Structure formats: structure tokens, C-alpha cells
Design a protein around this ligand. Structure first.
Ligand SMILES: CCC(=O)N(C)CCOc1ccccc1Oc1cccn2cc(C#N)cc12
Ligand SMILES: [Mg+2]
Ligand SMILES: [Mg+2]
Ligand SMILES: [Mg+2]
Lengths: 402, 552
């Protein structure tokens, strides 16, 4: 009933972000959602003396439409507020619960409401948008879980007491619940917590396994007959990998090429050359030496289209000091097109990133910006949105991570 | 007539006070005009005489563009000090997105701003003063009670008020369409023209009850409507006629205004091109700097004048028919599109000629054009169109598959209308057997800018060409050009240049660089080319020898 005073960081005004344009289908859905949200008092219409704006989108989490607010800009402008469980990444199972509906029972500081204003756009500038602001704690605002935190601790304290070895981490609108139980015991423990949440008036509708995911090691080709070209590729790849693993050598491998040979000439792999390569497959097995996570610095993710539905990614903070690497595969399954694939990959990397470090990475996306701005919501399911930019994949980065 | 609408609360920017701009002295003629206008406005409640305490002022002026007088106020200072507002609409509806209506009426709101009240606590900051004869006496203090013309908040607060005021009328007439734009209303219906005039008369009297005067049924603008550069006929729209100047010299400014008018014409004139013309502004040092016209710009402008000769129109929108877009290639880098529902009844047209990069290829550009059409369709019609494209599935599938970048390709049907869109060449994915292997290198003195390109092949051929005023990057491409030049129809090339590899693997078919355009011609003439990369200065063999050669 009583609100919590909220302020912007000193010397900052609220967000003024453009509303992207939407299909009539998505506008139609947003007007239905917002009409009921207003009926329930969760938002109210606003006048022209409110200059602020956050974009809104229609997505699907099901066949009914959901509404997503991109509070990235507001979140940057309110970060003022108030240890991330390192064991969560270890647990055998981790299940994610959408608890974002808890927020809508909480008044939002009346002085801050203007900063949450948003617009439902019209088609072809016929009308100006319909304009609302938030009366309650909105999903996606990083202030919402901070304000609700005390209530959340209260509702969870019983359940944590019964289950001292179960890890519960909150990030934005989601609870991450991790156990070492057998899967059936795990899902039962989840169902209890869901039942406990519901009967305390906190509604709730994805299980991960962080114990399995590993950081990919570099893979060198294994061939029956090697040509000059194959040895050149091998030498180039191993040259690349030696910025990372000191111990790699190419002396014996490149010796096999001394001369000026036709590209397709078959080079037998001599004994010393095979020894060097076998040793190099061994060096590529171990993990790197001094790569640690600095929580002050941003996480960056890069993604490469590998073809045939495959995508490689790296998360790092300093170039060539990779905290994690991975490769995602996609089943053609009718469509599974490039954007659907990239969009799913981004969500998986972000989830993994939230589980391991508790923050989302900043993506370098291999796609034209406008193409992304156009289609990313056709497949977006998360309730969060990471930062991203747009880049042009280098030529050899692709084949070296393949 | 001031309306009983509620006022929007207005605040000054926090930590600023009201303007105190002292009034400039005025000729006794102008002082007389103001006093009579101000008394007439006082009569109507639009402004009020204020005490001595109000410490604010904003300069006032009197003009009559050479009959009547108008009062003009300079709110520049006050504007700077008042809070921001939700931006009044900028974008305007596009005629190709209007739905055909049987009757459309154009209402102008007389003195829109003066018809709406200004919230009370903000009225003090609008104080102005009519100068006394020569400061002989004290002047007249006045303040505003309605939205002043030229103040920062008037456009948005007016539009907000108009919207609220409309709601109740629109409620009881869901069969009448009302566009709101600045101080205009455009009211459309398919009712019998008789009861349509009935409903217009109702709406006018509803606005009058709320303080908004509207034109009589004998002063309501008649079609075809001159609106925002357009002609809106009852069954077609087109742009208002374009006049391209003829000049012996062209300044940066003349060119800018020229690319403007051509851009305007491309929304319905198929074929407009502006690439070579706007190349002329790549430096655009000053708006006055004269810019010599290249030959290509001359031909571009000449061809545009030919298109403008014929007259052209667009059609309005039918939500029940499909939406269809076709794209035609229109020269190097430049593309043209039409959007329509009826095979020759265009809704609108447009262009796309962005390189967005030093080198590209046709499939990349067509995919970008499809992007811009998609964004535009969403904006204008809230849906994406069907595409009819002069490119076969084989071509496009191969490209987007091999393309390292993620790409969305809509449903389209192939339309066989040359010039079709094709991959002009494709590099080999594997080295070629029986083809000569050229080990190329280039080098340039980063100081003297002299260079060489060289090769060494497996058949024992070697060669070095000298280069002047060049760069390590330009030579690395030149070495590749050389090997193309001196090879048979099949060739393996090995380079140590990530720069040069990156450019060639991208498989461009058009470039800003003549050297890259030369390599491209070679690549087409070739039957098979395989390009391979090795790390430099690692003694690989072939690469080491041509490095020794060229680095000597
Ligand atoms: C079919 C026959 C026609 O004549 N128009 C033009 C298309 C009909 O669309 C309408 C629908 C409802 C209300 C007004 C309409 O017209 C305008 C729409 C948007 C902006 N407008 C500016 C003017 C002026 N000056 C008129 C309109
Ligand atoms: Mg429209
Ligand atoms: Mg460009
Ligand atoms: Mg070199």
C-alpha cells in the first residue's frame, strides 16, 4: 500500500526512446492488453506534459499475446539501488520460474510514474500513439525486483528452510531454482515451490543443466591423406591458437611444405610432423592459464554463422581471454531460419550468462541492424533484453571456431 | 471562443525562472495596432491585464505583410525555459495508405491555439507589454489565458485537447473516419452524401460547443486537395508538380535542394535516380562551394527530366486486396520498386541505391532493398507485402546459405523480367587439381609509397611489377590482380593478406575502387579460382619465396 521513493541517478533525465513501428496485428494486441491493464488500474493514460518514452512490443511466451517493455534505457538511468551464487552453475538441474506477475500488486512511487511512459503507435501516422504510464511495479524495470525483494525473501524463507541445499537465484522477472536431486525429485521440488508461491497469491506459468555444459576446446582435423592446402589450413589454425596456448609449434609441420608446391599435392605426414601435431592436440585439451572474471567489466558475446544451422559463440571481457565458448545446433524442422536461429542462440547465451555470472552480455550480432530491428520479436520469448550491436564476421574467425 | 476543456499542467525547467526580455521600442503606428488587437483579445478572454508585480516580459511586435495587422510575440526565451512535451506528431500519413472514402471533408480550426486555455499557474510567465508612446507613460501589462501562438507547448497541448474533445463525437459515429493533423480535420464517410453533410454539420456544432470554430458548408475546401506536397483526388493521389532548375553553376546548396525534389518524386515517379548526384556531396564543404558536375551526374539529371515529362499518379488503399512489391535493377547499385494491389495501379514507388560499404554484390543489395520495402510497408499499411523478384531461388538460396551473415528472406515468386539478378562468379571451395599455384605478395614503403606486386608459381614462374604511390593494402590486391592476369582459366592463388582475402571472399561484383573492379572482371573471365590464406612470415613455402622476392 505504501510506495518506495525512487530517484534517477544525479544529473540524468528519464528515457526518450523512439517507438518502433508495428504490424496492425501487434498494435491490435497491445490495445487489447492495455485496455484491460487500465481497467485493473495498472496503467493510466497521460497527457502531453509527459515527454518520456520507452518502446513496447507484442511477443509470445503460448498463443495469447504478451507485452514486452524495453526498459534498457530506463534501467541504465536508475541503477542506483540497495553474492551471486556461484553454486547455481554447478547444480545438476536448474529450472526458471516467471514470477514477474508478483510486481503488479505494488504501487510505484507516484513521482517516478512519468518515467515509465510508453506509446502504442498507430498505422501510417493516422493518430498519435495511445500514451500510458505505470501505476505499479512494471516487469522489466530493474527497480521492480529490488523493491519486491523483501517480499520475495519472506515468501521463500519457509521453502528454503525445508530445502537447505536448493539454490534460488533471482534475476529480473525470473527465479533460478537449482538442485542436485534426481530429475523427478527436482521437478517435484519445483512443483512444491510453485504451489507454495501460488497459495501466497503469486502466479507462475524451461529446465537447464549447467553441470553438463563445457567450454569447447580447439579441434584439429584428422585426415587420411593431407594436401599442401590441408597443411596450410592446419598451420594457420595452429598459428591462431598459439596466441592462446603458448606451447604450440609449427616448425615440423611447415617444414613439410618447404619448396613451392602445387596446392593439391599430397604431402605424407612425416614422423616428426605427426609427433608435433599429436603434441598440439594435447595442448589444446587443457584450459587456459590466467583467465578470470572481473565483475566490474562488461561481458561481450560474439556469434558466428557456421552453416547448416550451426552457430559458434564466445563470451569474453578482454580479447582472446574467453570465459566461455560454445556451439549451438538447430533442427531444420520446417523453418528454423537464420533469424529464428540467431534469436534463439542469443537467448541461450544470455541465460547461460545469467546463470554463471548474473549479468547479461553485450552482443556483437552478425546481422544487418534493420533486419534485426524488424524480426527479433517474431521469436523472442525472454522477458529481458540484452544490449547488442551489429558487426561483419571476419573471414578466418569462422573456420577457426568451426 | 475559449473552450471549457481542462488545462494541462505546465512547469518550467527545474531551477529556471520566467523570461525577463525587455521590450524593444516601437513606432507609434505599431503601438496603436497592438492596443486595438489587445483590447479585442481582452474582450474575448484570450489575454488579461495584470498587476504591477508580475516581473516577466517577452517582446511583442506588430506586422502586416504588404489588409489587416497581426500581432507577433518572441517567446524564444520563454520557450528555452519551459519543460519538454511529448513531441507533437512529426511524420504525416502517406496518401498511399489512405482507404478510399465516398465523401471526405476538410475542416480548418480557426484560431486553434487561442481557443484552448492555458493552465493558471503558468499564465504569469507569458506577460508582455505594449510600449508607451516614448516611455512617456508606463506601458500596458497583459498576460495570456490561452495557448499563445509560437510558445513551445501550444502544438502538443492543442492536439491533446482536440483529441479529448473529439472522443465523445467519434463514440456515437463509428462509421465516420476523422484524421487530425495540426489545426485541421479530415472527415471521411461512405454515407449518402446527404446524411454525410448531416454528420459534418453535427460535428461542426459539437466543436462549436467546445469552442472550436469550423468552416461553413460553403467555405469547406474543395478537392483535389493541395496537402503537404500532394494532390489528393477523389480516386487518385500524386505529388504536386516538380520544377528542377537549370543552372550553369551548382553550389552544394543547389544540389541538396535538387536531391530533395528528386527524392520527393521517387515515391510515385518510377525510375528516379540520385546516386551520382549525391556522390557530388560526399565532401559538401559549404552550402555555397560550387561543385563541378561530373558527366554521370549530368546524365542522371537528364534522364530524370525525361521521366518527369510524363504525368503519373498513385492509387489509394484497399485492406481486402493483397499487397505486392516488385523490384527492378536500374543500373549499377541502383534499384527501383513499385507497390500495388492492382497490376498497373501503383500505390507508390521508390528507389534504393545504397552501397553501405566500399564493395557489394547484386544479391546483397536486392536483399537490402527488400528490407527497406518491408520497413516502409509496416509503417504505411501495418503489414508486409508479397514480393515479385527478378531472381531465381537457386541464385538466392546459394547466396544466403554461403553468406556468413544472418538474413531473412520473405516469401517471393520469381519474375522473369531481365535484367535478372545473378551471381556473376563463384570461388572454388576446394583447391583445383592441375591448375597452376600462384604465391602472391605485395609490399609498399609506408613512407615513399612505392611498391611492388610479385608472384612465384609451382611451375617455376616468378614476376615483379613496380608500383608508385600505393599502400601495403593496395599492393596486396595488386598481387592478386597480377596472378589473375598471368594465369590460365583455372588458378590457385595463395595470399598472406587478411585484408585482400576478406575483400575477395565477400565475392563483390561492383566496387568504388577501379582495381577491385578490375579483379572482378578477371574473376568473371576465369572458370575456376581458389583463394587460400596462410599466416605471413612463418616460412611456409611458396609464401616465403614470394616474400623474399617482393621484399628485396
Ligand atoms: C477516397 C478519397 C480521398 O479523397 N482521400 C484523400 C482518401 C480518403 O482518406 C480519408 C479518410 C478519412 C478522412 C479523411 C480522408 O482524407 C484524408 C486523409 C488523410 C489526410 N488528408 C488530408 C486531406 C486534405 N486536404 C484529406 C485527407
Ligand atoms: Mg491512414
Ligand atoms: Mg552508402
Ligand atoms: Mg605480405
Amino acid at each position: 500500500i505504501e510506495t518506495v521513493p525512487v530517484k534517477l541517478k544525479p544529473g540524468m533525465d528519464g528515457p526518450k526512446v523512439k517507438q518502433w513501428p508495428l504490424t496492425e496485428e501487434k498494435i491490435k494486441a497491445l490495445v487489447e492488453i492495455c485496455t484491460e491493464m487500465e481497467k485493473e488500474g495498472k496503467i493510466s493514460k497521460i497527457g502531453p506534459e509527459n515527454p518520456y518514452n520507452t518502446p513496447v512490443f507484442a511477443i509470445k511466451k503460448s498463443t495469447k499475446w504478451r507485452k514486452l517493455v524495453d526498459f534498457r534505457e530506463l534501467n541504465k538511468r536508475t541503477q542506483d539501488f540497495w553474492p551471486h551464487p556461484a553454486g547455481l552453475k554447478k547444480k545438476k538441474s536448474v529450472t526458471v520460474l516467471d514470477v514477474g506477475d508478483a510486481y503488479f500488486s505494488v504501487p510505484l512511487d507516484e513521482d517516478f510514474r512519468k518515467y515509465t511512459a510508453f506509446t502504442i503507435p498507430s498505422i501510417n501516422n493516422e493518430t498519435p500513439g495511445i500514451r500510458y504510464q505505470y501505476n505499479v511495479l512494471p516487469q522489466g524495470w530493474k527497480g521492480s525486483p529490488a523493491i519486491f525483494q523483501s517480499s520475495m525473501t519472506k515468501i521463500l524463507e519457509p521453502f528454503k528452510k525445508q530445502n537447505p541445499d536448493i539454490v534460488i537465484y533471482q534475476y529480473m522477472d525470473d527465479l533460478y531454482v537449482g538442485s542436485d536431486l534426481e530429475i523427478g525429485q527436482h521437478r517435484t521440488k519445483i512443483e512444491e515451490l510453485r504451489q507454495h508461491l501460488l497459495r501466497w497469491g503469486l502466479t507462475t506459468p524451461y529446465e537447464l543443466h549447467p553441470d553438463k555444459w563445457t567450454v569447447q576446446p580447439i579441434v584439429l582435423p584428422e585426415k587420411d591423406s593431407w594436401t599442401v592446402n590441408d597443411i596450410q589450413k592446419l598451420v594457420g589454425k595452429l598459428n591462431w591458437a598459439s596466441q592462446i596456448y603458448p606451447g604450440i609449434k609449427v616448425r615440423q609441420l611447415s617444414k613439410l611444405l618447404r619448396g613451392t608446391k602445387a596446392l593439391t599435392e599430397v604431402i605424407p605426414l612425416t614422423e616428426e610432423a605427426e609427433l608435433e601435431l599429436a603434441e598440439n592436440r594435447e595442448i589444446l585439451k587443457e584450459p587456459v592459464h590466467g583467465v578470470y572474471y572481473d565483475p566490474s567489466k562488461d561481458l561481450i558475446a560474439e556469434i558466428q554463422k557456421q552453416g547448416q544451422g550451426q552457430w559458434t559463440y564466445q563470451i569474453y571481457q578482454e580479447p582472446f581471454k574467453n570465459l566461455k565458448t560454445g556451439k549451438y545446433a538447430r533442427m531444420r524442422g520446417a523453418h528454423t531460419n537464420d533469424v529464428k536461429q540467431l534469436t534463439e542462440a542469443v537467448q541461450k547465451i544470455t541465460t547461460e550468462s545469467i546463470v554463471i555470472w548474473g549479468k547479461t552480455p553485450k552482443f556483437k550480432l552478425p546481422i544487418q541492424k534493420e533486419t534485426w530491428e524488424t524480426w527479433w520479436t517474431e521469436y523472442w520469448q525472454a522477458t529481458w533484453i540484452p544490449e547488442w550491436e551489429f558487426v561483419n564476421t571476419p573471414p578466418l574467425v569462422k573456420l577457426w571456431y568451426q | 471562443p475559449i473552450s471549457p476543456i481542462e488545462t494541462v499542467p505546465v512547469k518550467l525547467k527545474p531551477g529556471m525562472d520566467g523570461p525577463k526580455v525587455k521590450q524593444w521600442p516601437l513606432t507609434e503606428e505599431k503601438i496603436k495596432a497592438l492596443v486595438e488587437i489587445c483590447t479585442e483579445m481582452e474582450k474575448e478572454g484570450k489575454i488579461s491585464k495584470i498587476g504591477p508585480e508580475n516581473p516577466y516580459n517577452t517582446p511583442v511586435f506588430a506586422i502586416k505583410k504588404k489588409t489587416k495587422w497581426r500581432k507577433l510575440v518572441d517567446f524564444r526565451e520563454l520557450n528555452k525555459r519551459t519543460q519538454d512535451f511529448w513531441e507533437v506528431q512529426l511524420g504525416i500519413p502517406h496518401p498511399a495508405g489512405l482507404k478510399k472514402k465516398k465523401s471526405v471533408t476538410v475542416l480548418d480550426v480557426g484560431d486553434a491555439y487561442f481557443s484552448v486555455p492555458l493552465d493558471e499557474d503558468f499564465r504569469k510567465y507569458t506577460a508582455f507589454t505594449i510600449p508607451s508612446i516614448n516611455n512617456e507613460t508606463p506601458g500596458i501589462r497583459y498576460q495570456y489565458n490561452v495557448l499563445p501562438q509560437g510558445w513551445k507547448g501550444s502544438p502538443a497541448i492543442f492536439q491533446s485537447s482536440m483529441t479529448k474533445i473529439l472522443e465523445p463525437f467519434a463514440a456515437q459515429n463509428p462509421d465516420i473516419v476523422i484524421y487530425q493533423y495540426m489545426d485541421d480535420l479530415y472527415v471521411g464517410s461512405d454515407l449518402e452524401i446527404g446524411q454525410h453533410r448531416t454528420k459534418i454539420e453535427e460535428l461542426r456544432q459539437h466543436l462549436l460547443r467546445w469552442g472550436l470554430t469550423t468552416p461553413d458548408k460553403k467555405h469547406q475546401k474543395e478537392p483535389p486537395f493541395l496537402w503537404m506536397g500532394y494532390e489528393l483526388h477523389p480516386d487518385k493521389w500524386t505529388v504536386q508538380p516538380i520544377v528542377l532548375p537549370e543552372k550553369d553553376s551548382w553550389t552544394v546548396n543547389d544540389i541538396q535542394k535538387l536531391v530533395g525534389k528528386l527524392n520527393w518524386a521517387s515515391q510515385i515517379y518510377p525510375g528516379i535516380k540520385v546516386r551520382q548526384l549525391s556522390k557530388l556531396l560526399r565532401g559538401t564543404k559549404a552550402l555555397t562551394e560550387v561543385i563541378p558536375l561530373t558527366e554521370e551526374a549530368e546524365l542522371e539529371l537528364a534522364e530524370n527530366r525525361e521521366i518527369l515529362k510524363e504525368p503519373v499518379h498513385g492509387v489509394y488503399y484497399d485492406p481486402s486486396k493483397d499487397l505486392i512489391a516488385e523490384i527492378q535493377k536500374q543500373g549499377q547499385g541502383q534499384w527501383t520498386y513499385q507497390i500495388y494491389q492492382e497490376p498497373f495501379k501503383n500505390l507508390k514507388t521508390g528507389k534504393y541505391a545504397r552501397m553501405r560499404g566500399a564493395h557489394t554484390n547484386d544479391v546483397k543489395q536486392l536483399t537490402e532493398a527488400v528490407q527497406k520495402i518491408t520497413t516502409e510497408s509496416i509503417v504505411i499499411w501495418g503489414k508486409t507485402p508479397k514480393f515479385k523478384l527478378p531472381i531465381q531461388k537457386e541464385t538466392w538460396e546459394t547466396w544466403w546459405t554461403e553468406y556468413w551473415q544472418a538474413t531473412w528472406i520473405p516469401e517471393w515468386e520469381f519474375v522473369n523480367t531481365p535484367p535478372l539478378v545473378k551471381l556473376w562468379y563463384q570461388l572454388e571451395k576446394e583447391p583445383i587439381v592441375g591448375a597452376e599455384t600462384f604465391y602472391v605478395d605485395g609490399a609498399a614503403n609506408r613512407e615513399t609509397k612505392l611498391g611492388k606486386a610479385g608472384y612465384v608459381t609451382n611451375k617455376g614462374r616468378q614476376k615483379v611489377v613496380p608500383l608508385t604511390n600505393t599502400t601495403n593494402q593496395k599492393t596486396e590486391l595488386q598481387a592478386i590482380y597480377l596472378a589473375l592476369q598471368d594465369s590460365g582459366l583455372e588458378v590457385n592463388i595463395v595470399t598472406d593478406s587478411q585484408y585482400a582475402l576478406g575483400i575477395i571472399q565477400a565475392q563483390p561484383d561492383k566496387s568504388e575502387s577501379e582495381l577491385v573492379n578490375q579483379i572482378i572482371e578477371q574473376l568473371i573471365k576465369k572458370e575456376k579460382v581458389y583463394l587460400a590464406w596462410v599466416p605471413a612470415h612463418k616460412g611456409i613455402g611458396g609464401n616465403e619465396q614470394v616474400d623474399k622476392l617482393v621484399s628485396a
